[PDB]
């Protein structure tokens, strides 16, 4: 994993944001309830 402070999230230009650093070891526990995926393309007929 990597950490990035300056974040433009939702891409809107003209305004950025900086996330101040947090003192010390950071720990967060998360529970994964969902997913988002995409598919490939024709490739080979009824193959994979």
């Amino acid at each position: 994993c990597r950490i990035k402070q300056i974040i433009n999230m939702w891409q809107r230009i003209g305004q950025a944001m900086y996330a101040p650093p947090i003192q010390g070891v950071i720990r967060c526990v998360s529970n994964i309830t969902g997913l988002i995926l995409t598919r490939d393309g024709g490739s080979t007929n009824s193959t994979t």
Partner: antibody
Amino acid sequence: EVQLVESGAQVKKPGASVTVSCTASGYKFTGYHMHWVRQAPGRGLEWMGWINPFRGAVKYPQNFRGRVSMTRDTSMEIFYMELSRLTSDDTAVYYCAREMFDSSADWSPWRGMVAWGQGTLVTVSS
Amino acid sequence: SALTQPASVSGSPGQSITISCAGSSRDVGGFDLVSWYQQHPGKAPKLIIYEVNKRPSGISSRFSASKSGNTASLTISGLQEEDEAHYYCYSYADGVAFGGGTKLTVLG
């Protein structure tokens, strides 16, 4: 109006790599898909992929996957495309095209190609 | 190319011609997504038909197209010298599927 302007024709050695740009203008850049198509001389159209400017979402085809590096500069409004491991079979004229209907919120399409790049001739000879 | 087109079509100036796009039910039959492009020699391809029949803004009313089952068709009436050029039928089968392309000429 809108315009799709690509880079210049290049002459390179085989096995090397080549990058080609496209610079759109006159519309909302971050919200419009960009197709890339090469046409070998006398051949038909060969679709090489597309890049959604929104966060940079890309999808390529099967036969071109792994030699194709396609990006865009949303700041400077310049699409990019790259082909490596140059072979004589990779010599063609490469285009960039936009899908018909776009937006910043909902989407669709597939079919649409309206605005077309002028083409860029990449030559591979030893 | 996954879509079948004629190699060349010749017709007399002023007549009507039909260009066929034929494929499986994966593209032509099971989708409305067939589209057609004009290309002048040495210049970029230009869209002509989409949605199996549609005309983008600024296409001559003489042009039109359709799809019959697994076979899609293109039609150009009022033929003129500006129409002598390459035409390619595109349809979507999960990818981008094209036609081989067809050349237009004068007949007689």
